[PDB]
Ligand binder design. Structure first.
Ligand SMILES: [Zn+2]
Ligand SMILES: [Zn+2]
Ligand SMILES: [Zn+2]
Length: 92
């Protein structure tokens, strides 16, 4: 059986949210530090690389492709063919 008389719980000091593990709190605290340098001017997105921010910024002028079998959408017809082959067909 389990050791001790009680468990342990982890809590945010900035928004009072509660987490089951310390690693979940450490990953949550990233929103309160907001330390990623390359921030999007259009949305809440941020990056550690200017080239990776450029790979994000092109999505604000992108176009979606939609599934014929479900409600799914993605930003490439090649990615859509690979969605269909995995989710609606058998994998080759
Ligand atoms: Zn918080
Ligand atoms: Zn953005
Ligand atoms: Zn689909």
């Amino acid at each position: 059986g389990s050791s001790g008389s009680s468990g342990k719980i982890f809590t945010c000091e900035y928004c009072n949210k509660v987490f089951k593990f310390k690693h979940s709190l450490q990953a949550h605290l990233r929103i309160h530090t907001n330390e990623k340098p390359y921030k999007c001017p259009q949305c809440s997105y941020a990056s550690a690389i200017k080239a990776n921010l450029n790979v994000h910024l092109r999505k604000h002028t992108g176009e979606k492709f939609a599934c014929d079998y479900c409600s799914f959408t993605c930003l490439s017809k090649g990615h859509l063919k690979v969605h269909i082959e995995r989710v609606h067909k058998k994998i080759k």
